[PDB]
Design an enzyme around this catalytic site. Structure first.
Site, short mmCIF file in Angstrom:
data_model
loop_
_atom_site.label_atom_id
_atom_site.label_comp_id
_atom_site.label_asym_id
_atom_site.label_seq_id
_atom_site.Cartn_x
_atom_site.Cartn_y
_atom_site.Cartn_z
CG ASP A 119 5.16 -7.74 13.72
OD1 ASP A 119 4.49 -8.01 14.73
OD2 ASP A 119 5.70 -6.62 13.67
CE1 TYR A 175 4.53 8.16 15.00
CE2 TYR A 175 5.47 6.98 13.12
CZ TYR A 175 4.47 7.13 14.07
OH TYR A 175 3.43 6.22 14.10
N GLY A 209 7.24 0.83 8.95
CA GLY A 209 5.95 0.27 9.38
C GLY A 209 5.33 1.21 10.40
NE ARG A 259 -2.91 -0.26 3.23
CZ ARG A 259 -3.85 0.70 3.20
NH1 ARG A 259 -3.57 1.94 3.59
NH2 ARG A 259 -5.07 0.41 2.77
N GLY A 260 0.20 2.35 -0.48
CA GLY A 260 0.79 3.68 -0.45
C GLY A 260 2.09 3.79 -1.20
CB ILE A 261 5.27 5.55 -0.24
CG1 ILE A 261 4.81 7.00 -0.39
CG2 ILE A 261 6.77 5.44 -0.58
CD1 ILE A 261 5.32 7.95 0.70
CB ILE A 273 4.07 11.54 -0.32
CG1 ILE A 273 5.57 11.91 -0.34
CG2 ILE A 273 3.64 10.66 -1.51
CD1 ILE A 273 6.01 12.84 -1.47
NE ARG A 285 2.09 -3.01 10.13
CZ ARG A 285 0.91 -2.63 10.64
NH1 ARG A 285 -0.08 -3.50 10.76
NH2 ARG A 285 0.73 -1.37 11.02
CE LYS A 309 12.95 12.50 8.80
NZ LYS A 309 13.31 12.85 7.39
#
Lengths: 218, 207, 207, 218
Positions: free
Chosen positions: B53, B129, B82, B17-19, B162, B39, B133
């Site tokens: 996972d 986060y 994730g 999904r997504g990016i 995004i 997942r 990162k």
């Protein structure tokens, strides 16, 4: 889902030798329309050449105009360097920093009007060189801030140790301790990055500095 | 002077999904052999998927093993993230930071042995986060220092906003495809001399 | 035009040895009220100590509580780092990254409430250490973004080679006191407008 | 264990107004011997003044010499700025980048000989300004690389939004959204950082950029 190729009007400053030539030839193989500036020695067979001292604002103006008439307005600008006392310091600043500004400024109005522009600055591979390299980055980030809303991006390529004709002339392996890749890079390795930054895949990268140095500048 | 294409064995974590999905799809169209972890919602049509996972080191090992059998040992790893209490902090750190380590570590043996590897960590688009990162970038730089001699690079893609705004020079959001475009380049033969880099994909935001 | 001195309630984690001890001693000589946490070997003579394992959130809470009673609510926190398998990775991340979060979080309530706070994280002098150190910088920058409105700053000191060499512009190691000098400045009234900064103390190494 | 104070021969360029004055007065209150350059208007009572256009290498040379005779060789150099077309771009580059180089180069031999030197560059608080600021940082890091083995460090102070006489003249609060501290800084806040970088506590900091911006440049 790859974006279809668009053949751009490209100008490569100092595109007749070394890393400049590699870039020019790569971009031409990609399918762009590639022009190069030189200092009088001539553009390599195939490509369109203009003589330009980037120290001279009028020479830059006339160069862009000849290119425009030949192949259309410059859409992709690749700015290559360029080249302790006051004279030596101001000479490198003039060629490498203000020279970058001159060509960037001559390019900007057409790019803004057409809502397309890629400015790609190739940093030099010592106070004067360090200062002018950091200055170009500062300038590029500043162009990116002003012009990105018009789809005109400005990004920098920062080459590490690259094998040129002039690199091979030095007593060279002491440099490899500082490179995680444990090898020198090729002109083609740098040109591959310019090719990406010139492509339809790089549209959301602006104000970036990409190091091509095998890990060196970490 | 373009280097000839080489079809790589690719693993994209969270490639459903997504990016993650846009990355997996771009790399497949590029001509790579693309597998994804997910997942539990399922892999994309046509692509080989495995449930992982990334907090589970044993599930990481099993996935890599099943991929090695299917399409050959993993040559390029795209690590997608994730996803304030001590519980929530440690959770995000386990998934996004330690999870990246688990996949990077499971991938590294075969990359060093075979003298080719491209590790591509996609940073996340709070204190947890920010730390995860930044922690991934430091970890990528460390892997880059260690493994680049063996032709095994580690680079980070830092996406901005995004779509999956005035304070953005570009004055627009990026598409998931603009991200996948940069991953395609990082996975290609043109990126051999890029190692330990953070490429921002943000329309000038993080300048 | 120097601002007048204010005696702060200071907590220095790991303030019993090495760089930690030199920090605690400098701040005490500066005229602050200095407490230290330690791993069990004892506090320095004259200074109020408490035993803390920074992986233990409850031990963090108890320590801060005992310090608040002794000398008043903590105004400046100096967070010193406490010190390849999945086990060793998670261990260093728990101590150096999550440990910093635990102390930073326990300190933050009272700093915001009282409209003064200085958080000073000392980075460590491997993939786990690189990630922990980078993770702390990202976490500090995040705290700086959130709490600076309340006069609560977060800055990082990045020491190089400290004695507790050709590839160093200074061509020598640093003393633990050169580090403590920078912490003294960060804890002072002269640092009010510095927030989210990483100050390298390395003789030019990490340039 | 605080290092005993040593009263340094200090030169502050543009030390008669704004942030420059704050720095000059702070350093004098610290117990240093402080000289300032100005453009003709005069050094503030108390302090030693020399007239210097940093665009002019001979004026810089004569200034350092008058200072040397007055209070001993310059040990601590505080370089303050300094000040889209080609003329505007080269003017800012000359004052802000090459001007920084001129004063740094005139200072360097004495500092190397004496095995003590602190060069502190105050970055400006737009392509020309961005380029010259980034250039000074690049230059400072380069001086740090060459001179640190001789106990000559070079560090940069990067001020955010600071309340000057000229700052107060602007329609200003839109700037506060970008500042985590949610307030403008004072000249004294910057001078406090210079005071630290000039002290005996900063000896192992070299090639650093300290931002004084309430979190802004994060």
């Amino acid at each position: 889902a790859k974006p279809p190729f668009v053949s751009r009007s490209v100008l490569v400053t100092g595109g007749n030798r070394g890393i400049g030539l590699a870039i020019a030839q790569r971009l031409a193989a990609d399918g762009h329309k590639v022009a190069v500036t030189h200092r009088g020695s001539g553009a390599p067979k195939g490509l369109f050449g203009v003589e330009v001292d980037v120290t001279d604002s009028d020479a830059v103006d006339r160069a862009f105009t000849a290119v425009e008439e030949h192949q259309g307005p410059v859409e992709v600008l690749v700015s290559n360097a360029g080249l302790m006392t006051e004279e030596k310091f101001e000479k490198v600043i003039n060629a490498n920093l203000t020279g970058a500004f001159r060509v960037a400024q001559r390019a900007s109005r057409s790019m803004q009007r057409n809502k397309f522009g890629r400015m790609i600055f190739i940093a030099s591979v010592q106070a004067n060189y360090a200062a002018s390299k950091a200055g170009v980055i500062g300038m590029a980030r500043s162009i990116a801030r002003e012009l990105s809303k018009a789809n005109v991006t400005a990004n920098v390529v920062a080459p590490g140790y690259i094998d040129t004709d002039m690199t091979r002339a030095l007593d060279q392996q002491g440099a490899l301790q500082f490179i995680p890749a444990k090898r020198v890079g090729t002109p083609a390795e740098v040109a591959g990055v310019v090719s990406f930054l010139a492509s339809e895949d790089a549209s959301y990268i602006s104000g970036a500095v990409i190091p091509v140095d095998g890990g060196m500048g970490m």
